């Protein structure tokens, strides 16, 4: 197969205003343009810490120690130099290639590219219009800006390098992630850090035990985030306020811990069964009705605004995205069989637990565990990590028994930065 990222970018490559360009994000201020890299149709990478997407997060300096929460890690200097940004680009590229090298990742990335956020921007119900927050503004060689629609942007982490807990992370663009429309996703991610987990379920799900012997493959972490992005691009994410008041783990239960249904869905495996079957049927009916609303909007559309593109070219983009049926009079409708397949593909087939099987890596067995440790890594050298094998390199002592993920055996590949065990209020 042909690679997912066709250009091996170096951070210092000259801007060209096309796939290497200074850009601005909608709704951020008169931010200084940032240098960004288009790695695939609809997908950009910004090798900067995210001081833009959310107004409440602008400084990278660590809080006072007495304010910091235990599962957190700060490093204000991370991703501030050209060499780091170069390594970041190469690391993220390699992980997209590792994902795309599996049939499951091919399926997911294809769904992501086809998941163009719906043109529901118009005030007038017969007019088809892009929503502005679903684009970026790209500086051209002549110094002018052009608006470019995109689906996904990978960006560096904000102040807290390891990011949110057991509910939200993608963020909400009004109801766009939940009303069938979809919206452009900004994923905070770093290929330069990973976390440790424990190989025994009794230990991994206990807040008091384990130092984090095994390292999570960061391809699984990126796949996890891309699965959320898939839900959000198709507008079928579950409101983070729909949660499981965990009562299957004594330690979660005594601390009143809650996990969003969206996280359980995204992990898959046995976790998804904790989504009450009645609430899941309700969700499905809800999303099915949102899709019907979209078919209706396209059926009523006489005109298109912005764009030089055809009213029919764009009607067909969304017919393809949502797998709509078209009758003899050109009317669009939602087919129940096809909705069931699309919804299932996005929520049951694309799961963390399924990616673990395709990568043949060791991984947490449930989302309902406790983090153990965070490590510094470098996956760019092929002597450290490959597209095909991750850390578990063929023809080395690391090929068998997940030895490459074993931070005790493969110790030169991990630098432990912080332990989380014993910090949890128990
Ligand atoms: Na798993
Ligand atoms: Na070490
Ligand atoms: Zn998640």
Describe, in plain words, how this protein is organized in 3D:
Zn(2+) binds at residues 224, 228, 263. The active site is at residue 225. Has proteolytic activity. In vitro the whole toxin is reduced to release LC. After translocation into the eukaryotic host cytosol, LC hydrolyzes the 197-Gln-|-Arg-198 bond in SNAP25, blocking neurotransmitter release. This is Botulinum neurotoxin A light chain. The chain is α+β, with helices and mostly antiparallel strands and 426 residues long. The protein has a single domain (1-426), classed as Metalloproteases ("zincins"), catalytic domain like (Zincin-like, Alpha-Beta Complex). Helices cover 28% and strands 16% of the residues. The strands form 5 sheets. Strands 6-5-1-2-3-7-8 form a 7-stranded mixed β-sheet, covered by helices on one side. Strands 10-9-16-17 form a 4-stranded antiparallel β-sheet, with no helix packed on it. It binds sodium ion (2 copies) and zinc ion. Zinc ion is lined by residues 169, 224, 228, 263, 266.
Helix and strand content put the structural class at alpha+beta
CATH class: Alpha Beta
| Shape type | globular
* CATH fold descriptor: Zincin-like
> What string, H for helix and E for strand, traces the elements in order?
EEEHHEEEEEEHEHEHEHHEHEEHHEE
Question: Main sheet, how many strands, which sense, barrel?
Answer: 7 strands, mixed
Helix content: 25-40%
Number of domains: 1
Q: What are the bound molecules?
A: sodium ion, zinc ion
What would you say the CATH architecture is?
Alpha-Beta Complex
Strand content: 15-25%
Tell how many strands the DSSP assignment holds: 17
Q: Reading side by side through the largest sheet, how are the strands ordered?
A: 6-5-1-2-3-7-8
- The value of Rg in angstroms is 22 Å
- Total helices: the number is 10
CATH H-tier superfamily: Metalloproteases ("zincins"), catalytic domain like
Distance between the termini: 50 Å
Binding site for Zn(2+): 224, 228, 263
Protein name: Botulinum neurotoxin A light chain
Active site: 225
Function: Has proteolytic activity. In vitro the whole toxin is reduced to release LC. After translocation into the eukaryotic host cytosol, LC hydrolyzes the 197-Gln-|-Arg-198 bond in SNAP25, blocking neurotransmitter release.
């Amino acid at each position: 197969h042909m690679p997912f990222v066709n250009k091996q970018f170096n951070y210092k490559d000259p801007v060209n205003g096309v796939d290497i360009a200074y850009i601005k994000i909608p709704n951020a201020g008169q931010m200084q343009p940032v240098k960004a890299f288009k790695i695939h149709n609809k997908i950009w990478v910004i090798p900067e810490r995210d001081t833009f997407t959310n107004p409440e997060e602008g400084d990278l300096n660590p809080p006072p120690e007495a304010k910091q929460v235990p599962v957190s890690y700060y490093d204000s200097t991370y991703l501030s130099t050209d060499n780091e940004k170069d390594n970041y680009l190469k690391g993220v590229t390699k992980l997209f290639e590792r994902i795309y090298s599996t049939d499951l990742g091919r399926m997911l990335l294809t769904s992501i590219v086809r998941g163009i956020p719906f043109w529901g921007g118009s005030t007038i119900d017969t007019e088809l219009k892009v929503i502005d927050t679903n684009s970026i503004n790209v500086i051209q060689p002549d110094g002018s800006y052009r608006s470019e629609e995109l689906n996904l942007v990978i960006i560096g982490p904000s102040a807290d390098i390891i990011q949110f807990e057991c509910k939200s992370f993608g963020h909400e663009v009004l109801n766009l992630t939940r009303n069938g429309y979809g919206s452009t996703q900004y994923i905070r991610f770093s290929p330069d850090f990973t976390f440790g987990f424990e190989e025994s379920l009794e230990v991994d799900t206990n807040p008091l035990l384990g130092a984090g012997k095994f390292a999570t493959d960061p391809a699984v972490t990126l796949a996890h985030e891309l699965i959320h992005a898939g839900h959000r691009l198709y507008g079928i994410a579950i409101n983070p306020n729909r949660v499981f008041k965990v009562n299957t783990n004594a330690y979660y239960e005594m601390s009143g811990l809650e996990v969003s249904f969206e996280e359980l869905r995204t992990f898959g495996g046995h976790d998804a069964k904790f989504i009450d079957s009645l609430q899941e049927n309700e969700f499905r009916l809800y999303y099915y009705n949102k899709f019907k609303d979209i078919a209706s909007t396209l059926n009523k559309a006489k005109s298109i605004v912005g764009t030089t593109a055809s009213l029919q070219y764009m009607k067909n983009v969304f017919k393809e995205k949502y797998l709509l049926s078209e009758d003899t009079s050109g009317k669009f409708s939602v087919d129940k069989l096809k909705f069931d397949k699309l919804y299932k593909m996005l929520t049951e087939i694309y799961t963390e637990d399924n990616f673990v099987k395709f990568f043949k890596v060791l991984n947490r067995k449930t989302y309902l565990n406790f983090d153990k440790a965070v490590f510094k890594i470098n996956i760019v050298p092929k002597v450290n990590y490959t597209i095909y094998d991750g850390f578990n390199l063929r023809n080395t002592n690391l090929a068998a028994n997940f030895n490459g993920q074993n931070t005790e055996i493969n110790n030169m590949n991990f630098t432990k930065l912080k332990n989380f065990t014993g910090l949890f209020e128990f």
